[PDB]
Design a protein around this ligand. Structure first.
Ligand SMILES: *[C@@H]1O[C@H](CO)[C@@H](O[C@@H]2O[C@H](CO)[C@@H](O)[C@H](O)[C@H]2NC(C)=O)[C@H](O)[C@H]1NC(C)=O
Ligand SMILES: *[C@@H]1O[C@H](CO)[C@@H](O[C@@H]2O[C@H](CO)[C@@H](O)[C@H](O)[C@H]2NC(C)=O)[C@H](O)[C@H]1NC(C)=O
Ligand SMILES: *[C@@H]1O[C@H](CO)[C@@H](O[C@@H]2O[C@H](CO)[C@@H](O)[C@H](O)[C@H]2NC(C)=O)[C@H](O)[C@H]1NC(C)=O
Ligand SMILES: *[C@@H]1O[C@H](CO)[C@@H](O[C@@H]2O[C@H](CO)[C@@H](O)[C@H](O)[C@H]2NC(C)=O)[C@H](O)[C@H]1NC(C)=O
Ligand SMILES: *[C@@H]1O[C@H](CO)[C@@H](O[C@@H]2O[C@H](CO)[C@@H](O)[C@H](O)[C@H]2NC(C)=O)[C@H](O)[C@H]1NC(C)=O
Ligand SMILES: *[C@@H]1O[C@H](CO)[C@@H](O[C@@H]2O[C@H](CO)[C@@H](O)[C@H](O)[C@H]2NC(C)=O)[C@H](O)[C@H]1NC(C)=O
Ligand SMILES: *[C@@H]1O[C@H](CO)[C@@H](O)[C@H](O)[C@H]1NC(C)=O
Ligand SMILES: *[C@@H]1O[C@H](CO)[C@@H](O)[C@H](O)[C@H]1NC(C)=O
Ligand SMILES: *[C@@H]1O[C@H](CO)[C@@H](O)[C@H](O)[C@H]1NC(C)=O
Ligand SMILES: *[C@@H]1O[C@H](CO)[C@@H](O)[C@H](O)[C@H]1NC(C)=O
Lengths: 168, 213, 115, 49
């Protein structure tokens, strides 16, 4: 907000009278500018949590499990996924102005797809260093160990577990 | 540790910011003692010298209202800035508990890598943590299998991964390459080898069987 | 009409005294060389290149400026490198060495008590 | 949450959904983020001595 243009607004008898109040309008513009600079740091801290922009391999077959509804859609200008397309369809004046965000949401969708391909291809290794590939069934079996289940319970029930994931 | 000392001796912007904001607000508070707010001057010894008491009340009230407004704006913005310093200190108190008096498993809470240990250092109005982490390096690829079939049974590693250097099959631990012969001491058995997908055929060595004989 | 803020982009007086000017969300045909139209306004005094670097001075809507190519430039920031994991249904990568790293983290705990 | 539920596996109870956290996937929303948490839920118990 332009303090002077909201208050006075064009007139000139009002600007000289408002000049008598000191730095009340400089403080308000500083306060609003700090807020706007904080909104970009919010988004940088949530989404730019990845060194490289990782890609999934073309074959796209992770021991079964089916991630097609959450991987990006190549037939789109925005390259969003099917669920990211569902989510985006559900949500000048007297000195007032709206600034645009530093990151487009194409860029945000590109950060999220890289976080997804890091996880589906390397498990948790890309979050601690270089991405180390591992087959998805074996990564799922490592995770079953982390909750205290023995890892043949996964390999002997792989198809049922993959069907339950797909239905959910 | 020798490089921290260079990089600092040659970065404390979050501490410098706090200081700057408070000084910039205290200066704006004093610089308001020289505005009229719609009066004849900014000095009470000038309204009490060229106005009679019935006329100086009206001019003193215009200053009182402005100065009260400015003081109360100062006091609101300090409450809002202190509520933010409070959350930062609450996070610092949790990091001192969880990274300095313990080893954390939370990812990216005590550095980037695998947390080993943390050291505190005091700063002017805050604290610096030095996080020591482990980072793996110099990876190779091998080929893997989920289980090994032998004598009609399926074997799984007790705490590792089955790997192949091209012709032979070993067990390693998952974060550091150190291959071992697959025996019945580092694997366990469950089931027959036709329900797992990806089983490979290989021999699992029994230590007693030869040694005894 | 067509009001808006005016911003000045400078590489720092210890580097140069050249300057570029952003007229915020103003159509660049009604401002009063290099005139360049952005989703964030009209930029004057910087040339638009086709390369893409890491962001230096943030203009907005994906555009940054730098003093590189001497003068300032515009472009679209870089999300990061490009790493391609050789994923397969029977391949694994295992580390053979490690590094011990140590980093810093700075946190404010107090501010000054005034009365 | 993005650090601890997407870049790792969490043992903190209820930080990444109900059940034993297996893994989590992020999706971008307008001005926000959506987390799809995959968890393991035990079922069909029997009693024993
Ligand atoms: C992953 O799941 C999707 C369903 O969400 C599959 O796509 C559907 O497949 C059925 C038949 O299996 C078709 O009738 C639908 O028209 C498909 N929907 C589409 C293409 O949007 C998809 O085939 C699955 N992936 C694999 C590899 O099987
Ligand atoms: C693991 O093996 C893969 C498979 O070859 C290697 O990845 C390929 O490396 C070459 C040369 O760097 C590239 O041209 C290919 O594009 C890569 N991907 C393929 C072939 O899918 C990788 O370098 C190996 N990793 C290690 C640590 O040796
Ligand atoms: C895989 O590792 C094995 C080590 O057990 C290699 O086989 C041995 O290699 C050494 C030196 O070449 C020989 O002295 C041994 O006779 C080999 N056999 C055994 C049973 O120890 C094997 O060459 C490695 N393969 C590859 C492709 O590197
Ligand atoms: C792993 O070993 C088993 C047993 O040695 C193999 O099973 C035999 O496979 C041959 C060829 O398909 C058949 O003629 C035999 O009847 C099988 N015997 C049994 C008991 O199943 C199995 O094929 C081996 N796997 C691989 C990939 O070579
Ligand atoms: C693991 O990495 C270290 C480096 O961090 C290697 O040690 C270095 O070896 C080179 C060449 O021998 C020396 O010039 C350096 O002085 C060594 N660094 C240190 C800190 O001593 C080590 O050889 C690697 N180990 C393996 C098995 O590759
Ligand atoms: C395990 O046994 C207990 C009884 O010892 C079962 O609990 C009873 O459940 C029935 C049906 O819900 C109730 O009508 C009874 O009142 C319960 N008993 C008591 C003492 O309150 C329990 O359901 C059994 N669970 C399984 C998995 O078998
Ligand atoms: C892996 O994929 C190959 C295709 O190249 C296929 O022949 C093989 O059966 C698959 N194995 C597993 C364990 O998925
Ligand atoms: C600032 O000027 C000093 C001396 O003129 C020089 O040493 C320093 O590199 C300059 N800084 C930058 C960022 O150019
Ligand atoms: C500025 O005005 C011209 C003339 O109508 C128009 O073609 C142009 O698109 C306008 N600018 C933008 C950013 O639309
Ligand atoms: C940038 O590349 C585009 C490709 O479509 C081209 O048309 C344009 O002329 C290039 N810009 C410059 C300044 O060369």
């Amino acid at each position: 907000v332009d303090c002077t243009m909201y208050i006075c607004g064009d007139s000139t008898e009002c600007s000289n009278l408002l000049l008598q109040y000191g730095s009340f309008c400089t403080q308000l513009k500083r306060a609003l500018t700090g807020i706007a600079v904080e909104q970009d740091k919010n988004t940088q801290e949530v989404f730019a949590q990845v060194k490289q922009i990782y890609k999934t391999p073309p074959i796209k077959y992770f021991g079964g499990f089916n991630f097609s509804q959450i991987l990006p859609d190549p037939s789109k200008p925005s390259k969003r996924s099917p669920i990211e397309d569902l989510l985006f369809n559900k949500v000048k004046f007297n000195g007032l102005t709206v600034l645009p965000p530093l990151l487009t949401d194409e860029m945000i969708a590109q950060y999220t797809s890289a976080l997804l391909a890091g996880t589906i291809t390397s498990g948790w290794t890309f979050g601690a260093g270089p991405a180390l590939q591992i087959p998805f069934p074996m990564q799922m079996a490592y995770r079953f160990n982390g909750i205290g289940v023995t890892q043949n319970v996964l390999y002997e029930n792989q198809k049922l577990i993959a069907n339950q994931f797909n239905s959910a | 540790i020798g490089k921290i000392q260079d990089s600092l001796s040659s970065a404390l912007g979050k501490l410098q910011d706090v200081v700057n904001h408070n000084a910039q607000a205290l200066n704006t508070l004093v610089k308001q003692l020289s505005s009229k707010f719609g009066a004849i001057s900014s000095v009470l010894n000038d309204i009490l010298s060229r106005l009679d008491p019935p006329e100086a009340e009206v001019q003193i009230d215009r200053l009182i209202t402005g100065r009260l407004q400015s003081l109360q704006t100062y006091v609101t913005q300090q409450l809002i800035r202190a509520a933010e310093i409070r959350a930062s200190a609450n996070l610092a108190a949790t990091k001192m508990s969880e990274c300095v008096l313990g080893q954390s498993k939370r990812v990216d809470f005590c550095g980037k890598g695998y947390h080993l240990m943390s050291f505190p250092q005091s700063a002017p109005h805050g604290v610096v943590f030095l996080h020591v982490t482990y980072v793996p390096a110099q990876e190779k690829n091998f080929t893997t299998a989920p289980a090994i079939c032998h004598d009609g049974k399926a074997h799984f590693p007790r705490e590792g991964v089955f790997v192949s250097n091209g012709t032979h099959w070993f067990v390693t631990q998952r974060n550091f390459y150190e291959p071992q012969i697959i025996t019945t001491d580092n694997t366990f058995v469950s089931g027959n080898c036709d329900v797992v997908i990806g089983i490979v055929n290989n021999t699992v060595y029994d230590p007693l069987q030869p040694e005894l004989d | 009409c067509s009001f808006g803020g005016v911003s000045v982009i400078t590489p720092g007086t210890n580097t140069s005294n050249q300057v570029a000017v952003l007229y915020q969300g103003v159509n660049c045909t009604e401002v009063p060389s290099n005139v360049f139209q952005t989703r964030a306004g009209c930029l004057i005094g910087a040339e638009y290149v086709n390369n893409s670097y890491e962001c230096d001075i943030p203009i907005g809507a994906g555009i940054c400026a730098s003093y590189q190519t001497q003068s300032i430039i515009a472009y679209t920031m870089s999300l990061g490198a490009e790493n391609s994991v050789a994923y397969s249904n029977n391949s694994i990568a295992i580390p053979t060495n490690f590094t011990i790293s140590v980093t810093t983290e700075i946190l404010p705990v107090s501010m000054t008590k005034t009365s």
